[PDB]
Design a protein around this ligand. Structure first.
Ligand code: FAD
Length: 391
């Protein structure tokens, strides 16, 4: 029997969640996935630990989804980040919160998240067929026909959850945009968002250092968040966020101690005048950062003259960094752009052009910061798309 009430294409978080709600509402539901495994992209989020959502309040959630977050009022009125947390804990998955509201499985293993979702799908009678690339979708009368190279499936309701365009090696290569265009939907310009930065800097001096809530400035863009020094440049939220405003050739500025004024730092130094400059700074900064700034100066605080102190303080508060480029769309964490939201019903995620056609997840023209916000949108829009609505 190749006929289902609801067919979902793409088994990332949107598709898995859509399969669960579709089954929960009593639809006979089929999830088709290109890869052998579900949630291949999802599994690599949060350094492989799976940043499944964010525990913030409404203000935090909206701030975390700056690419059309407003569209989600109705979705979030039906299923939100607290429902995601509840769902996992109610199915015996223990969750924890880390910095900036980031939620993870306590196990620190993505398979904990993915297996719980599969288990729920099975328990609700959903069917999943993996290792099956869908290559065609068409609608005739009131039936969608979904085809691989090899087989055909039909349904009354189709949900497209095939992702965006970044990290195409995980399986997100744009098929959902093709389906959209086939049904005469507008797909907006697609472009990199949340892109690690390439810099011209001595990377080995600092690589692997993470800094908490430091400030990166370029023009009027001042971003305060965590920063990661990498072998090629900068990553972590502060760099990812600023990457929306730089593309190469710019000088950006780093303030490693945003909570201390230049005067506070001058007082700190005066109160530690008998000390080694590098050692006394360890209470404020990681040792490798203290090494970087203090290397060319005299060893003890009191051995610095006034010029040296002022020079050092300005370096700590305003380090110039030369940005040479940013990762391509393929090498970025999020796709900015997707199916035009004007053509989508925000309450149901149904196409305004073709009845029974739905989109959820990053295939839509919604983009968010890393830290759980894209996964939240995908899970929540998935849930809602899979739900039935009565009136
Ligand atoms: C390295 C990295 C780190 C990230 N970290 C974070 C983070 O910390 N917080 C956060 O919120 N977001 C993060 N993201 C983004 C987040 O992972 C995605 O936005 C989210 O997974 C989108 O979910 P989705 O279900 O819309 O699409 P995806 O998870 O991309 O799933 C789409 C699925 O559709 C399948 N598919 C595509 N075409 C076909 C076809 N023709 N037939 C069958 N199946 C198909 C694909 O194989 C894929 O499994 C990160 C992304 C990357 C790449």
């Amino acid at each position: 029997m190749n006929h289902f009430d609801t067919i979902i294409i793409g088994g990332g978080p949107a598709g898995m969640m859509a399969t669960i709600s579709s089954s929960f509402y009593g639809q006979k539901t089929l999830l088709l996935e290109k890869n052998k495994r579900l949630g291949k992209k999802l599994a690599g989020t949060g350094g492989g630990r799976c940043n499944v959502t964010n525990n913030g309040n409404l203000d935090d959630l909206m701030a975390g989804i700056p690419g059309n977050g407003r569209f989600l009022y109705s979705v979030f009125s039906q299923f939100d980040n607290h429902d995601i947390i509840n769902f996992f804990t109610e199915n015996g998955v223990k969750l924890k919160v880390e910095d900036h509201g980031r939620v993870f499985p306590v196990t620190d293993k993505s398979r904990t998240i993915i297996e719980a979702l599969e288990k729920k799908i099975a328990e609700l009678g959903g069917t999943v067929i993996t290792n099956t690339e869908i290559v065609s979708v068409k609608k005739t009368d009131e039936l969608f026909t979904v085809r691989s190279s090899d087989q055909a499936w039909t349904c009354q309701k189709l949900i497209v959850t095939t992702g965006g365009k970044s990290y195409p090696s995980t399986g997100s290569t744009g098929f959902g945009h093709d389906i959209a265009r086939h049904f005469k939907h507008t797909v907006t310009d697609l472009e990199a968002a949340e892109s690690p930065l390439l810099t011209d800097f001595p990377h080995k001096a600092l690589q692997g250092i993470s800094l908490d809530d430091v400030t990166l400035s370029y023009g009027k863009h001042i971003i305060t968040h965590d920063l990661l020094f990498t072998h090629f440049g900068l990553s972590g939220p502060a760099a990812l966020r600023l990457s929306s405003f730089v593309k190469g050739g710019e000088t950006i500025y780093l303030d490693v101690l945003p909570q201390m004024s230049q005067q506070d730092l001058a007082d700190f130094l005066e109160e530690h005048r008998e000390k080694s400059l590098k050692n006394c700074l360890k209470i404020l900064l990681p040792e490798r950062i203290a090494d970087f700034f203090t290397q060319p100066f005299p060893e003890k605080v009191k051995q610095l003259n006034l010029s040296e102190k002022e020079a050092l303080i300005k370096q700590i508060k305003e380090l110039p960094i030369s940005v040479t480029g940013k990762m391509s769309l393929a090498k970025s964490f999020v796709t900015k752009g997707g199916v035009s939201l004007k053509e989508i019903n925000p309450k149901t995620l149904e196409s305004k052009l073709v009845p029974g056609l739905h989109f959820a997840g990053e295939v839509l023209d919604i983009n968010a910061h890393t830290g759980g916000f894209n996964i939240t949108s995908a899970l929540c829009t998935g849930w809602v798309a899979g739900s039935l609505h009565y009136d």
